[PDB]
Amino acid sequence: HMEAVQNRIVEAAERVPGVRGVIHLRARYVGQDIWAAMIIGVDPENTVEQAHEICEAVQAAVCGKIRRIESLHVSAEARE
Amino acid sequence: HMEAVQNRIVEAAERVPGVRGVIHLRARYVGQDIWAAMIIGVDPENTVEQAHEICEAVQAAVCGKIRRIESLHVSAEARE
Ligand code: NA
Ligand code: NA
């Protein structure tokens, strides 16, 4: 149930160009809404600006696909 | 007093190669120790790996100069 929604979140994020895994996801219910914080992996050789753009793209993809999410903060860390 | 130490933290961070301001600093006392979390600005065209290296350098500089700090998490965001 909560796991079903967390699966959907990860899957959604992973389908965005430049995402190299979901490193961390904390989702919590505030009433019927989800508030969440995500850390994604990205190519270490992407620029900081590119990584920002991927994060923004993840936020839009995830928010667009999972209607119950009302807050989502995405940050990036180097992976592989 | 608490402000004096926060000033020292910011000053220390700002003297590290690649730091473009301190965007955020939250420092709190746990007993006599400081636990802190910092966000620094960096060149948007630095790579994610470079930004990681600057963060690590800030952690070392700040920890080295302010002995009461016992925990310090540094992250980076694009600035100017
Ligand atoms: Na890439
Ligand atoms: Na630079």
Residue numbers in the entry:
A (entry chain A), B (entry chain A): 213 to 292
Paste lines from the article.
Examining this closed state model, three putative binding sites were revealed, in which Asp, Glu and His residues from the two monomers are brought into close proximity and may bind divalent cations. The central binding site is presumed to be the main site as it displays tight packing and contains two symmetry-related His285 and two Asp249 residues. The central binding site D249A mutant also displayed a significantly decreased magnetic response that correlated with reduced numbers of magnetite particles per cell (−47%; P<0.001, Mann-Whitney test). Although the average particle size in the cells expressing D249A mutant and in the cells expressing wild-type MamM was similar, the crystal size distribution of the D249A mutant showed a minor shift towards smaller crystals whereas no defects in crystal morphologies were observed. Furthermore, only the D249A and E289A single mutants revealed an additional slight decrease of the magnetic response during iron induction experiments with iron-starved cells. The D249A, H285A and H264A mutants displayed a minor increase in the number of binding sites compared to the wild-type protein, which may be the result of an increased void volume that allowed the accommodation of additional cations after amino acid substitution to alanine. Therefore, the reduced magnetite formation reflects decreased MamM activities caused by less (e.g. MamM D249A) and/or shorter (e.g. MamM D249A+H264A) TMD activation events. (ii) All mutants exhibited an apo-MamM CTD-like behavior along the MD simulations, and (iii) an absence of structural differences was observed.
One of the most highly conserved and abundant integral MM proteins is the CDF transporter MamM. MamM was recently proposed to function as a magnetosome-directed iron transporter required for iron biomineralization since its deletion abolished magnetite biomineralization and mutation of residues within the conserved TMD metal-binding site resulted in alterations of magnetite crystal size, morphology and even mineral phase.
